[PDB]
Curated annotation (Swiss-Prot):
Catalytic component of the SWR1 complex which mediates the ATP-dependent exchange of histone H2A for the H2A variant HZT1 leading to transcriptional regulation of selected genes by chromatin remodeling. Transmembrane segments: none annotated. Present with 656 molecules/cell in log phase SD medium. The gene is SWR1. Component of the SWR1 chromatin-remodeling complex composed of at least ACT1, ARP4, RVB1, RVB2, ARP6, YAF9, VPS71, VPS72, SWC3, SWC4, SWC5, SWC7 and SWR1, and perhaps BDF1. It is found in: Nucleus. It comes from the Eukaryota. Belongs to the SNF2/RAD54 helicase family. SWR1 subfamily. It comes from Saccharomyces cerevisiae (strain ATCC 204508 / S288c). This is Helicase SWR1.
Amino acid sequence: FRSTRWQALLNFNTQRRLLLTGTPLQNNLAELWSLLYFLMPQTVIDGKK
DNA sequence: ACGTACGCGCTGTCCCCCGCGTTTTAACCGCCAAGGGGATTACTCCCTAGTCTCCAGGCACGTGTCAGATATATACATCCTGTGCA
């Protein structure tokens, strides 16, 4: 979440997003929730609830 | 008025840094998070000098005196002139 290419690619003009990855990690929910943030900006910052 | 010789114009030389293509490295980012000490703000004593004060004294000023420069007697000192001679 704290990288520069995070906010560098967020403000682009698009109507759809598609993420192509092999497999994410099971634990460490901050990066899974971060991929949920980059999917669409509707998720709140609470991942511990 | 003279003069002469160096600034200037011209010509030949050669060489050295610019233009461009190819090689190599400095720095920003991702990871992966932590602390750290030094100016800042606030507070709290504490004691050195401003201010007032009076007592003393010392360097600018006036005068004494020698150092150095100056103008003038002076004892010889070199031409000139009578002057006597062989």
